[PDB]
Structure 1
Amino acid sequence: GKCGPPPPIDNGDITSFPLSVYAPASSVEYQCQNLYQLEGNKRITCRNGQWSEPPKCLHPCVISREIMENYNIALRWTAKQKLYLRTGESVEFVCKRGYRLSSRSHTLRTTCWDGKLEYPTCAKR
């Protein structure tokens, strides 16, 4: 019950060189590009001529200084200048002088997920 080549994944690849045919019970492993986060089983196995479901590579986020300025917020730790955030990594923002966390805002601490970072808003005080 041999299987064909392992499926491709965005922003990731298998750790071994791909072959056109794999024997039953064979397995290969994926890893994602730098700063991308693996979701699901990193290993896949050939069972009954079919590969098990491959994983995803979740996107990192980029902290936009443009969005921060527009939202009247700033980074709490500015010497530790993080540009990227891994999925699952969080950041702490502070209001800029003259503003306060707004009513309908996300918490000042926020976690990147698959490229999506929710910036908090601070309103005029």
Structure 2
Amino acid sequence: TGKCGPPPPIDNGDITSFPLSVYAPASSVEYQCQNLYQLEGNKRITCRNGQWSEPPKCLHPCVISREIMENYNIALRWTAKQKLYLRTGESAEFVCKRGYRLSSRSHTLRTTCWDGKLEYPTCAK
């Protein structure tokens, strides 16, 4: 019996159809994440008993921070082949600046961006 109101917005993501004021039971609408956002969960929500099915989250990309690399004495190995912004699941390959050795308890030299977070490595003289 229960119809659904309009579909809820989500961060960095849109519906692929124009919103209606009222949706019938079993109606579905479909979401789509912004370009560098990784669509996650169900791409379709469906109207089940007055309720909207839960909408996906859009996983954030990463920026590579010059601020940090400068601090942690690191540089990019393939500077030309290196994207400044990373989709989730895309990696970064660093290297120690000349005159520096890799830290001990540090993270590895290659690091995948996961939803906004990037684990950087550390270097010492």
Query: TM-score interval w.r.t. the shorter chain?
Result: over 0.9
CA drift of 1:66 comes to 2.1
Contact 2:96 / 2:123 at 8 angstroms: preserved in 1? yes
Q: Distance in 1 between matches of 2:82 and 2:94?
A: 13
Aligned to 1:98: 99
Aligned-partner SS, 2:10? coil
CA drift of 1:98 comes to 1.4
Q: Distance in 1 between matches of 2:107 and 2:41?
A: 28
TM-score relative to the length of structure 2: 0.94
Q: Distance in 1 between matches of 2:112 and 2:43?
A: 23
Aligned-partner SS, 1:68? helix
CA drift of 1:123 comes to 1.1
Aligned-partner SS, 2:32? strand
CA drift of 1:99 comes to 1.3
Q: Distance in 1 between matches of 2:55 and 2:102?
A: 41
TM-score relative to the length of structure 1: 0.94
Contact 2:3 / 2:25 at 8 angstroms: preserved in 1? yes
CA drift of 1:49 comes to 1.3
Contact 2:82 / 2:92 at 8 angstroms: preserved in 1? no
CA drift of 1:20 comes to 1.0
Paired positions, count: 124
Q: Distance in 2 between matches of 1:73 and 1:63?
A: 11
Contact 2:32 / 2:43 at 8 angstroms: preserved in 1? yes
Q: Give every structure 1 segment of 4 or more consecutive aligned residues whose post-TM-superposition deviation is greater than 3 Å.
A: none
Specify every segment of 5 or more residues in structure 1 that has no aligned partner in the other structure, as ranges.
none
| Percent identity between the two aligned chains | 99
Q: Distance in 1 between matches of 2:100 and 2:35?
A: 36
CA drift of 1:81 comes to 3.8
Specify every segment of 5 or more residues in structure 2 that has no aligned partner in the other structure, as ranges.
none
CA drift of 1:7 comes to 0.9
Is 2:39 aligned against 1:46? no
CA drift of 1:23 comes to 0.8
Q: Distance in 1 between matches of 2:111 and 2:69?
A: 13
Q: Distance in 1 between matches of 2:80 and 2:111?
A: 19
CA drift of 1:88 comes to 0.9
Q: Distance in 2 between matches of 1:28 and 1:100?
A: 53
Q: 1:33-57, CA deviations, whole angstroms, 9 ceiling, x for partnerless residues? A: 1101111111100011111111111
